[PDB]
């Protein structure tokens, strides 16, 4: 087997999905090369879990998954096992015993708009918490107690999705970031992805 995996496709994609609609891709049956990813200095964050970043090329993976989306800069560390918060509880949660790597690089030149982005959405005021690795795209009006609503907005009846205000002049804290957190099965099944070797 010898192929070049589409890490370029996921990393060099023009448009990433919103956090609430975090895009997921499945990669298998390929020879990956994490050395290029690891050695690049562009990445602001490269924290890994369960697998040291150095020896990725020495592991054979059953099947790999790539989850890509955007985040409002400063709270990038919020995406991690155990760590709690708004988006982690409502949008994207990782399992406590998660195995994989988390990537993040400033993408102000790729996401922010001069007037205002107003095109990346994150959910607020979800009824209950969010289990690890589960999508949530429902756009039903949230009733904050009291009388219920029927397709109406008003007091205690806020919309569930809120848009970001990414702009070039926002400060590193409020600048867009792109996270392409990966996930390795390590199921000990017939390997499909493995690093370069003879």
């Amino acid at each position, epitope marked *: 087997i010898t192929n070049l995996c589409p890490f370029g496709e996921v990393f*060099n*994609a023009t448009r990433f999905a919103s956090v609430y609609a975090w895009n997921r891709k499945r990669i298998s049956n390929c020879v990956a090369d994490y050395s290029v990813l690891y050695n690049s200095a562009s990445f602001s964050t490269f924290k890994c879990y369960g697998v040291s970043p150095t020896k990725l090329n020495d592991l054979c993976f059953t099947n790999v998954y790539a989850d890509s989306f955007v985040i409002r800069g400063d709270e990038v560390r919020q995406i991690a096992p155990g760590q709690t918060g708004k988006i982690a509880d409502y949008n994207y949660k990782l399992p406590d015993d998660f195995t994989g790597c988390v990537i993040a690089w400033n993408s*102000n*030149n790729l996401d*922010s708009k001069v007037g205002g982005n107003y095109n990346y959405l994150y959910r607020l005021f979800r009824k209950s918490n969010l289990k690890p690795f589960e999508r949530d795209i429902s756009t039903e009006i949230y009733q904050a107690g009291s009388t219920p609503c029927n397709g109406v907005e008003g007091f205690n009846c806020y919309f569930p999705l809120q848009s970001y205000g990414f702009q*070039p*002049t926002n400060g590193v804290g409020y600048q867009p970031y792109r996270v392409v957190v990966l996930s390795f099965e390590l199921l000990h099944a017939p390997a499909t992805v493995c690093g370069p070797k003879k």
Partner: antibody
Amino acid sequence: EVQLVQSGAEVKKPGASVKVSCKASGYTFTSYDIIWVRQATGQGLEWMGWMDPSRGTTGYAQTFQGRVTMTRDTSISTAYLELNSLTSEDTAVYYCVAHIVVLDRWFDPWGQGTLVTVSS
Amino acid sequence: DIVMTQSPSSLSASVGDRVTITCQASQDIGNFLNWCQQKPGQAPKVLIYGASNLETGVPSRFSGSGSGTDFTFTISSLQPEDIATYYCQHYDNFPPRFTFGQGTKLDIK
């Protein structure tokens, strides 16, 4: 490595329609946006529009909205720009240019252009 | 509507001298600016991206500075191949809107 080979110069009568091609190679054609910019003789660059090669969604400047249609052909990996109702002031060099996304960076390989002459 | 103003319109300088071109933004655009060059006949070639970083393969002579509203494009030492027009280029992301300045030509005395 990236090449934006483009069609040669063309001459058309006023009011006709011109279909300018743009050949791209060395990268995934149906993955990155493509835009067009015309430079008129004695004037600065002016941006034409944008066309996603995958979805087919398009967008144009309001100054000439409705006078153009940029199609595509993913099989041969060539972009097309159709300009109808040509006029004398439309004589300009058109530069098809891809909008490549290097990691947190925009890389812009331009084509050699195409000089279109509107006259009788 | 974002409107850029590149000055001076034209200038001349002997080879090896330091040349500076200013480019003022009507509205704040952070650092969404690039500097492009146009040799006679050839297609535009982006020289500086991000208003600070030099495009891969370009000689180190060129440099870019400034931010917010005003930007500066500087050639440390002029050379014969530098004869060309130079354009500002502001870009927006989702609608890939490009806006260019009036340009400026370099002519060695």
